[PDB]
Design a protein around this nucleic acid. Structure first.
Ligand SMILES: [Mg+2]
Ligand SMILES: [Mg+2]
Ligand SMILES: [Mg+2]
Ligand SMILES: [Mg+2]
Ligand SMILES: [Mg+2]
Ligand SMILES: [Mg+2]
Ligand SMILES: [Mg+2]
Ligand SMILES: [Mg+2]
Ligand SMILES: [Mg+2]
Ligand SMILES: [Mg+2]
Ligand SMILES: [Mg+2]
Ligand SMILES: [Mg+2]
Ligand SMILES: [Mg+2]
Ligand SMILES: [Mg+2]
Ligand SMILES: [Mg+2]
Ligand SMILES: [Mg+2]
Ligand SMILES: [Mg+2]
Ligand SMILES: [Mg+2]
Ligand SMILES: [Mg+2]
Ligand SMILES: [Mg+2]
Ligand SMILES: [Mg+2]
Ligand SMILES: [Mg+2]
Ligand SMILES: [Mg+2]
Ligand SMILES: [Mg+2]
Ligand SMILES: [Mg+2]
Ligand SMILES: [Mg+2]
Ligand SMILES: [Mg+2]
Ligand SMILES: [Mg+2]
Ligand SMILES: [Mg+2]
Ligand SMILES: [Mg+2]
Ligand SMILES: [Mg+2]
Ligand SMILES: [Mg+2]
Ligand SMILES: [Zn+2]
Lengths: 71, 55
RNA sequence: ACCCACUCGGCACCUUACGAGAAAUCAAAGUCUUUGGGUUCUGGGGGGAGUAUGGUCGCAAGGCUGAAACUUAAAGGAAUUGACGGAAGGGCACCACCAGGAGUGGAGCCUGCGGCUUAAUUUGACUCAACACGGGGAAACUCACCAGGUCCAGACACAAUAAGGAUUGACAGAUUGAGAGCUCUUUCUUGAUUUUGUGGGUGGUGGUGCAUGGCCGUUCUUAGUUGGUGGAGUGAUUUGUCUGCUUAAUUGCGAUAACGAACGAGACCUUAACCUACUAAAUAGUGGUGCUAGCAUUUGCUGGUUAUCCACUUCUUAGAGGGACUAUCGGUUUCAAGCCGAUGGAAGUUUGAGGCAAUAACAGGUCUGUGAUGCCCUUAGACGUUCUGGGCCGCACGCGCGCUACACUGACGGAGCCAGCGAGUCUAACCUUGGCCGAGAGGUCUUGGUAAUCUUGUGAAACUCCGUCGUGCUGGGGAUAGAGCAUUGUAAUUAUUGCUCUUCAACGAGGAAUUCCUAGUAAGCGCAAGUCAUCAGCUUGCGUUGAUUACGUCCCUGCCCUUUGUACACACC
């Protein structure tokens, strides 16, 4: 029977990007290490999970959407 | 009992109808309502004019 | 002239079958593979074709004689069984009339189908045998339709992206109907579970019911089908299976080259009628006995009574049985099957009502009941699934089932107040008494019941009874509509449903047509169940009130059977 109508606008899904994620720890010569971008305070999160920094925003991604804590 | 059997073209209906011997019925009526048996009499030797046994 | 007998020669006819024959049939078509009396003529698959050509006859039309090329697997004879007939001849039936009943068709509204309209008004079905059918009473759901938004729930294999990350999610904002991270802004998260690809799956109320299973409707309120041995025929086949008579019936009687059997019918089964007999019951009751209230007071009448005990089974309930066989008798008829009336009887229309139901036919219906299914379609911008909302209800009309009405055998107000078949609550929120608040709808506090135990005696409704109206579209009728209160549910506008008041249409008995129906039936009346969150003008059952008229028929209609005919047999589509 009948077929095929479009306004156009066919979409596409999440980008995910790539880069190379972890360069953020600053290692001084001989030999120690500092941690950029402080980690998260929830008990389900293991102190290796950080807080993304946008604006007004430092927010935890291991707990899915959970507990932006702004500093 | 009836069965769908599945072949490349399609399905064939299977219907089997089995009649088990009424006489053998065991736990239930052992013949048809149609079934009318007659019991066969005996031959008789007539007369033997009156005589009486005594015990 | 008539009769009787004989005999030749004739027009015929009957019965036969020693014989013949493919058969129908033939006293010749017999005397034929056991092949010979005499002789004339014709034919050698169908068609092309009685055509072309030549000869000849005719005034002409035409007559006579008369090829071939080519083409083709059959054409054809008799008979057989089916199927069909716009052939007869018998039948059968309230899905047919007769006689009558109550209607429908006219009106209002309710619903279904059509048409129209629409972004959508999803769709199946079209005489009986489609149109209150798809259990189809859709507010979301259902949903298949339309406008839009996510999702993969793409098994598995191979290949590649790739532990320097293959892939997943996301807070706030943009955005969106949406507090959908759909997608984007931004930057964390996530870890071999996926992603991209080919192959391959899967899902679908997408198609095909004209590819099929299953189921179902109709023929069929039908009575039809088959085989043993024996009779007939070379044979397919036939007779049995049939003039008549009789049944609801291929049910029988009977007639008889048939005799004796099988399925279907009947039997059977369920339910409804009868058990002062059998076995029993505080989940059924009756009696007696206590306890007790009112009235009469002479004992009595009528009730209440957690078991207070005695005793029982008529009511009731369901185990076990008995009863009907159209029995008795009188009519009638092949004095056969049967039919008919009275008597008896719980019951005598197959006792009433169903259940079950032979072979065979349909391109009947159903891929929208299915995780029944073949093929085709689609399969990620999905026809899959879901979320949002509308729509199946859309209204110049046509058609069908119905609901309510035109009233006085009636409406209304009091009042008397009578059933059966039913159904009901555990992972609950059902059947609900009772009491309280409310005009009503209804709310709320309790109560029993998984039920012969509580709701229930479902105190149903027609109806009976005393009145208010008084024949006036009237106080008959309740369409339409307005305003207000409640109830189901996330959600009620296009008003789910109910109440209250106001509004007071059509309809003054309905044209041509046309349906259902013969006794506790028809028709009037309500109830319970199905469906259900809410919603019955519908269905499936049930009881309550309860007739008029048949006891026939073949005229319309329909269908069954023989006879017949046939060039059909894919069977008059
Ligand atoms: Mg002759
Ligand atoms: Mg000739
Ligand atoms: Mg030839
Ligand atoms: Mg000739
Ligand atoms: Mg010829
Ligand atoms: Mg000629
Ligand atoms: Mg010539
Ligand atoms: Mg001459
Ligand atoms: Mg001449
Ligand atoms: Mg009439
Ligand atoms: Mg109907
Ligand atoms: Mg219905
Ligand atoms: Mg819907
Ligand atoms: Mg779908
Ligand atoms: Mg069919
Ligand atoms: Mg068809
Ligand atoms: Mg024989
Ligand atoms: Mg025979
Ligand atoms: Mg026969
Ligand atoms: Mg039988
Ligand atoms: Mg019967
Ligand atoms: Mg929807
Ligand atoms: Mg509809
Ligand atoms: Mg009752
Ligand atoms: Mg009761
Ligand atoms: Mg009124
Ligand atoms: Mg009629
Ligand atoms: Mg209910
Ligand atoms: Mg209910
Ligand atoms: Mg509704
Ligand atoms: Mg033929
Ligand atoms: Mg024709
Ligand atoms: Zn956290």
């Amino acid at each position: 029977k009948k077929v095929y109508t479009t306004p156009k606008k066919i979409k596409h899904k999440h980008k995910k990007v790539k880069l190379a994620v972890l360069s953020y720890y600053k290692v001084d010569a001989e030999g120690k290490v500092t941690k950029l971008r402080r980690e998260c305070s929830n008990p389900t999160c293991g102190a290796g999970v950080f807080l993304a920094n946008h604006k007004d925003r430092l927010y935890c991604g291991k707990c899915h959407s959970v507990y932006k804590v702004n500093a | 009992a009836t069965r769908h059997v599945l072949m490349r073209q399609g399905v064939l209906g299977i219907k089997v109808k089995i009649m088990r011997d009424p006489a053998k019925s065991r736990t239930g009526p052992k013949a048809l309502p149609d079934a009318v048996t007659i019991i066969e009499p005996k031959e008789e030797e007539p007369i033997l004019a009156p005589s009486v046994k005594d015990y």
